[PDB]
Design a protein around this ligand. Structure first.
Ligand SMILES: [Cu+2]
Ligand SMILES: [Cu+2]
Ligand code: NA
Lengths: 620, 620
């Protein structure tokens, strides 16, 4: 019944049938993206119209189309032809990955480059990577992938251990032609294997780890109704899934007495970019927009009980479309469970004689995706005390290169002759805020130091200052760890019992933002990543910080063009966009497979409640 | 056997007997501090000499003494008379705390102040707080406590809800004299109760929480030998306990194949200061040095199974001295357990077809202390991948005041008429480093941005730079979150297989440091707290960043005096001192009892190993 329910296999089948009968899904067509549209703004929305947005690619070279269909009425609502030289190319298709290696294997220039290195072409894997926009005028309007080569010594070998440096190729995946093959010189192919399951490398496995058993003998404390509606320890929310963004949280609300109080209307990771900082022409174009270009939801892992998710686990199995419109289930793609989280509150009072201890816990909603060599876990946490937290976990295998003789200022050495270029992993969280309703505002809070003098004779005083962000042109903010800078989202029309606006405080990790030169292509295409915080006025079509079609878009789409409207955000329906990321100088310990590193952010109540909201937690 | 074993009840009894026999522990003497001395630098050394350091107070006014005793040989090694007006007073005795409320209850100035407020003296509790050093000349060379008053309506009432603002008294606890009573005016005593176990405030307790069962059917994976030596998943260490510092970690080392490789010789929280930022004369002197003035180990809680520590727990019960030299056991004062810690490493490889997942775990060593209204948990974590982490958890009841009718820039309102002054909680971690041995150096590492141009034509390159700190005068460093600043401790004489020096990287949280004006009393006494990182050359007597005698001591001791020696620290026996803290602007949700907030730091290997150290972790 809920408009926020996960797409079903039947809905996707009906979308396929509607497109085919409309003539929009012939044999040269591919679905590059399909997803359900959220309901438009309207608190009296009663008639359910479930609609899907579809991007349709054409493998024969015709212009692609953006289509909106209504599965409820069985109709096409609109179909627009796209001019990709203007507004960007469609996301990369899974079937285009294989094309790159196959086309190169018959190209005379590629084979000559391999022959000079004495590499058997049957052992050379090609990583198919997004192209970006650089100096090559012939690429405008064409779907290009760029290929970098790795040697696989045998079928189970880790090819990442054996990069073929000094060589790159560009491929038109529609006309199926190799546009350029660039050979800048011969580098030795690193010879050590990186096979982390080979006993010769691992040594004898440890026998010292004893089991940890985590069970819930009465079942979990949360309930799941309607397929994806969660109720847990006064929290209420809907868990969505979109093939582009992955797990999306809707309608995050907290039951305060007899009142269901909204907090966040929609929470998602709306983009993530991985820019590389190696100036070699072999790699200086390399920037992954994992969300915008590749679609992180379509590569979600099936998560195995006891290994990926430990404890009393409830799974969701989202359904997505394949390239032809057939439904495909991601079995066990989302894990949900509660976890003990240590002490919540504790005090032993001398005067009253009362000793008080309570334990904390958190609800975990997670999924894991694999894009080539990297694997990312996305974790949303709800805590008893009203805190909301997001954490990204980065693991997998680092992207490699040769390590040049003489060293490098932009590449780490991991093994003899094996390098790992410096890079970042930068995320954008899109938080469509709804603190006690939709009339919200953002304040920047800095610590204020005070000078010793009159009214501060001992020089001990300090204070804080809050600055209201009233218009989009002033709502592009930077972190300042030194002044303890945070941002508060409040509702100026909803007061707590002390007559103060209710609010939530955003605590950032204050990691470095995008390091590339401001005049670079990546800085223009990933402009969101240059600043820590953006606030926009809500609009239906402003979904991603990089725009709708990120692949080979020349730049400026998304947040810089939204902000340019300079709209009122002082007590309005607003969206907070938080940039946060990891700067990765690879270390020897990251090889041959990388231990998890993490980054994230959290939101804590700030006068949202009239007192601590966990006074009714029992002792157990 | 082990020179790092915990003090035994027998050793403490023997110290008492030795001091008695020497004429140093008659009826008028009190032990203010007693602790074991670490072995001096030198392998083997004096076969076994257990030495104890004792601070002896005299309740008749005679000068106190510092005494060193050898329990092994039954001898006093040295005894020196202290000039406390010069070098500082001894730590506060537990028995002096009770004196303050009793003396004030018979002082006619105090009674007049309470009668003016219509308060019954039998219901007024006095918080006895350390005095610091301010403008009062009569306090030099005397042991002073200052008292702030709270009303307790009935014996089980939380007095913190009812501060009596506008009133403070100073007490000489040796001569039993009230020196000053300062009354700046009547404030209403806030009337709402703060009794977090009263059903009228909590409402009905939740029935929704289902049990989480954490068990270890085969027992834990660590072994405890010699009372306090831990071996766990390649880690080796000794867990010490000192009445001033609390839990101290010794000889942290990692078994890498056939070699036991040192990492940290001694790790402790060597000071903690809590400065208040309210310029009211009633509170502008308020600064707690919980470690140096109060001794946090003395107030460690007994931790109860299932509430404080959950899972398969191994306890230590350290022994301390009371004020007469009798041994006192802190039953179950230290918890030790291992915890699941999610995914360690994960990759699903398209080309090889191998899917790989491993789980992480950590070893936890913790204790909890209660000082008046505040309770602090101290947590040390060891991870499978070589990471070492410290976390402090702050909870308890916030210190209160009246909330002035015209508002305040330095106090938060928590309830009608009830305020909570702004303050910080700042920690100093002392890390006596031993990365692969004692020849170490510290490098500061910053991200380096590069401009677009020749050799960086696409403007994507970025780099890093390392600066060796070669002498103490240049080793006082500040955080810079914007440039991703970290510090690496390396050993230039011990290289990994790539011929790079082995190292560990310190990751700070980059929270604000001390906010007080640099000319204030607290900035001089807590000078360590004004900078994020200090490095000194190791010396036996440089134990605490504030010096040996913090109570009522002006500046002149501690870290600024140590670094003035400008010693060589480039490949030497060095000590890292890291400042980190929380800046607390109390929120309504912190009342009537505060949910845990946290701060800490971590150290991760940086080319210490020749590849990932967790390749031999099994799948289970
Ligand atoms: Cu990385
Ligand atoms: Cu606090
Ligand atoms: Na050292």
């Amino acid at each position: 019944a809920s408009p926020f329910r996960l797409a079903s296999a039947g809905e996707i089948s009906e979308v396929q049938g509607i497109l085919r009968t409309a003539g929009l899904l012939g044999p040269e067509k591919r679905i590059a993206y399909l997803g359900v549209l959220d309901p438009a703004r309207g608190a009296g929305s009663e008639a359910e119209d479930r609609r899907f947005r579809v991007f349709i690619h054409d493998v024969s070279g015709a212009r692609p189309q953006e289509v909106t269909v209504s599965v409820t009425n069985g109709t096409v609502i609109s179909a627009v032809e796209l001019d990709t030289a203007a507004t960007g190319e469609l996301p990369v298709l899974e079937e285009e990955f294989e094309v790159v290696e196959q086309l190169l294997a018959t190209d005379e220039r590629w084979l000559k480059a391999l022959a000079a290195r004495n590499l058997d072409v049957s052992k050379v894997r090609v990583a198919p990577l997004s192209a970006g926009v650089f100096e090559y005028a012939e690429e405008r309007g064409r779907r290009i992938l760029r290929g970098l080569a790795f040697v696989q010594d045998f079928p189970e070998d880790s090819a990442w251990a054996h990069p073929v440096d000094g060589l790159v190729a560009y491929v038109d995946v529609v006309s199926k032609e190799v546009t350029r093959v660039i050979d800048t010189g011969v580098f030795p192919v690193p010879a050590e294997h990186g096979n982390y399951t080979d006993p010769e490398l691992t040594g004898p496995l440890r026998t010292t780890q004893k089991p940890i058993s985590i069970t819930q003998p009465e079942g979990p404390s949360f309930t799941v109704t309607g397929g994806n509606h969660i109720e847990w320890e006064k929290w209420s929310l809907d868990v969505g899934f979109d093939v582009r963004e992955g797990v999306v949280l809707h309608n995050i609300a907290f039951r305060d007495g007899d009142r269901l109080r909204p907090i966040i209307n929609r929470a998602s990771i709306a983009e993530m970019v991985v820019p590389y900082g190696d100036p070699s022409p072999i790699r200086s174009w390399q920037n992954y927009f994992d969300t915008g270009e590749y679609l992180v939801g379509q590569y979600a892992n099936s998560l195995e009980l006891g290994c990926d998710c430990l404890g009393d686990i409830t799974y969701l199995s989202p359904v997505i479309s394949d390239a032809f419109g057939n439904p495909r289930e991601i079995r066990n793609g989302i894990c949900m469970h509660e976890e003990d989280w240590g002490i919540l509150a504790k005090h032993s009072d001398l005067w009253s004689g009362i000793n008080y201890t309570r334990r904390n816990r958190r609800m975990v909603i997670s999924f894991f995706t694999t894009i080539g060599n990297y694997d990312y876990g996305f974790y949303w946490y709800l805590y008893l005390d009203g805190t909301i937290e997001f954490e990204a976990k980065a693991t997998g295998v680092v992207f490699t290169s040769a390590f040049p003789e003489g060293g490098s200022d932009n590449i780490s050495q991991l093994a003899p002759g094996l390098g790992a270029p410096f890079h970042q992993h930068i995320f954008s969280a899109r938080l469509d805020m709804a603190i006690d309703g939709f009339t919200n505002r953002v304040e920047e809070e800095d610590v204020v130091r005070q000078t010793m003098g009159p009214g501060n004779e001992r020089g001990n005083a300090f204070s804080r200052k809050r600055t209201v962000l009233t218009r989009e042109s002033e709502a592009v903010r930077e972190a300042d760890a030194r002044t303890g800078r945070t941002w508060i989202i409040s509702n100026p029309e909803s007061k707590n019992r002390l007559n103060e606006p209710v609010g939530y405080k955003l605590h950032a990790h204050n990691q470095p933002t995008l390091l590339a030169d401001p005049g670079s292509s990546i800085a223009r295409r990933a402009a969101f990543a240059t600043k820590d915080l953006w606030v926009t006025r809500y609009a239906d079509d402003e979904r991603y910080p990089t725009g709708d079609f990120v692949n080979q878009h020349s730049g400026g789409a998304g947040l810089p063009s939204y902000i340019a409207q300079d709209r009122d955000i002082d007590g309005q329906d607003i969206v907070v966009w938080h940039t946060f990321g990891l700067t990765h100088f690879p270390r020897v310990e990251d090889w041959p497979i990388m231990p998890v590193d993490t980054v994230g952010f959290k939101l804590r109540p700030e006068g949202f409640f009239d007192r601590s909201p966990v006074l009714d937690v029992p002792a157990n």
